[PDB]
Amino acid sequence: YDPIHEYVNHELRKRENEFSEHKNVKIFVASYNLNGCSATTKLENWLFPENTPLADIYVVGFQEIVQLTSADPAKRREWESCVKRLLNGKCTSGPGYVQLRSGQLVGTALMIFCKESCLPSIKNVEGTVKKTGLGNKGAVAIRFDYEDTGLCFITSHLAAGYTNYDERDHDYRTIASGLRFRRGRSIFNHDYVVWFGDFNYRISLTYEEVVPCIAQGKLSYLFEYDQLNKQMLTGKVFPFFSELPITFPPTYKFDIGTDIYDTSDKHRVPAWTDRILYRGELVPHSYQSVPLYYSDHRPIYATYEANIVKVDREKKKILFEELYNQRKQEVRDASQ
Numbered sequence: 558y559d560p561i562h563e564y565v566n567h568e569l570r571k572r573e574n575e576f577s578e579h580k581n582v583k584i585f586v587a588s589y590n591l592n593g594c595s596a597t598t599k600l601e602n603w604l605f606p607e608n609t610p611l612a613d614i615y616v617v618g619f620q621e622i623v624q625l626t627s628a629d630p631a632k633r634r635e636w637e638s639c640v641k642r643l644l645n646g647k648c649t650s651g652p653g654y655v656q657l658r659s660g661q662l663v664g665t666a667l668m669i670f671c672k673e674s675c676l677p678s679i680k681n682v683e684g685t686v687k688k689t690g691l692g693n694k695g696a697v698a699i700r701f702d703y704e705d706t707g708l709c710f711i712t713s714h715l716a717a718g719y720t721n722y723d724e725r726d727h728d729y730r731t732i733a734s735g736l737r738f739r740r741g742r743s744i745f746n747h748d749y750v751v752w753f754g755d756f757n758y759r760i761s762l763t764y765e766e767v768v769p770c771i772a773q774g775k776l777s778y779l780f781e782y783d784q785l786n787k788q789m790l791t792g793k794v795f796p797f798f799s800e801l802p803i804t805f806p807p808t809y810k811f812d813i814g815t816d817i818y819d820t821s822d823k824h825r826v827p828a829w830t831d832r833i834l835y836r837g838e839l840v841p842h843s844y845q846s847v848p849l850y851y852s853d854h855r856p857i858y859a860t861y862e863a864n865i866v867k868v869d870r871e872k873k874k875i876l877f878e879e880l881y882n883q884r885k886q887e888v889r890d891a892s893q
Contacts (some may be wrong), residue, residue: 558564561888565880569873571824576873581840581862582675582703584831585612588712589849590592592813593624596635603847603856611647612860615640615654615670618697618712621852622664625693625717633659633666644670652726660697663684665754667697667712670831678704678867683738687729689716696732696754700747704867707747709714711736719759719826722784729794745836749863752798753833758785760807764826768818771806772828779807783829798834799842801859808846808855810844815850833859840864 559617587604604615617640622632637659645653652673659668665686671679680702688695694716700709716724736744744750761782770779780786780803788794797879807827810819820823831854833844839861846855 561881561884564829564884565877568880569877572876573838576869576876578867580704580865580867582613582614582865583610584614584616584619584751584839584861584863585858586616586710586751586753586861587858588618588713588753588755588831588833590809590831590852590854591624592621592852594851596632596639597851598639598646600639600643600849600856603849604640604643606845606847606858607843607860609860610707611672611741613672613675614703615644616699616710616751617668617670618710618754618868619666620664620712620714622661622666625664628663630661632686633661633668634643636666637668641670641851646866657701658682658684658686658699660686660699662688662697663693665695665697665712665714666678667710669698669699669701669710675691675703678865683742685736685738687732687735690731691716691727692723694728698736698738698743698744700738700742703863703865706749709744709747709750711744711750711752713752714755714768715757717757720761721789725756725758725784726788726794733735738772738838747837749835749837749839749861750798751835751839751859751861752795753831753859755830756785756832757828757830758783758788758832759828759830760784760826761787761827764819764824767827769805771818776803776806777798780829785829785832795834795836798836799841800832800834801841803829803843803844805846805855805857808857809853811850811851811853811854811855819853830854831857833857835859836860838864 696713
């Protein structure tokens with residue numbers, strides 16, 4: 558410990574704008590449990606929902622690239638190709654989007670695209686995956702630094718089942734402790750973390766209670782029975798993560814191609830299985846489900862503005878040493 562050092566850091570924080578530049582980066586996070594459906598570029602309502610500018614970074618997580626009952630890189634690549642075509646299709650002028658990196662764990666995949674103009678700012682991209690224990694479930698993660706700001710994105714597909722939220726919570730833990738990039742870097746060592754996907758948490762009511770509530774718009778009531786909200790409130794899972802309020806209906810268990818909830822004999826209870834949570838000072842904007850009908854789940858997305866900092870380390874180390882010496886000198890003269 559050095560008092561003079563603590564001093565300089567305090568002073569330097571006031572003059573930060575002398576060695577730091579701040580920029581806002583638009584991030585679009587999208588998630589979709591495909592139920593094994595085929596790759597397609599017909600995803601406009603999902604990736605360009607708004608009437609807003611294209612994002613700087615698109616982070617897309619898929620679950621069940623192969624429907625669940627051994628990892629298919631080809632299928633994943635088709636989705637990658639479809640997304641890239643869609644993003645670039647919107648860039649009718651100049652440079653478009655490039656795939657930074659993608660990761661895959663069985664049928665769960667994560668792919669990140671950014672505008673080419675963002676590339677020079679993106680560094681130390683690392684990826685990893687972690688399967689769940691207690692299989693085809695788990696997580697895929699990718700992190701990177703945008704200038705001097707660290708970002709980590711995680712998509713996952715957690716334990717299925719109606720009442721087994723204990724297993725889901727264990728999955729959270731297995732993944733949060735088990736995901737390690739290079740040199741043991743963890744997911745928490747970042748300014749912004751977005752963790753999302755098919756967490757599989759359910760609404761703890763029966764099918765007959767839930768369906769008319771959703772038809773009548775009683776989402777708040779249904780939310781009181783949502784397992785994820787319950788487990789997060791207690792801090793057992795996703796501590797320090799926030800979720801924007803949910804204003805869209807349960808994204809799960811639709812007869813394929815229709816607005817209708819599971820009319821199969823299985824009579825699965827609707828649920829908000831698909832979610833996007835964030836940790837850190839991101840500025841959230843939207844959080845919605847989109848009407849795509851290829852799967853028994855609706856896809857969802859969330860948007861964020863992420864403040865980025867670019868620090869001139871040279872200019873900063875100079876002021877530090879300067880303020881440090883001036884202070885060390887002020888201390889010398891005072892002792893005379």
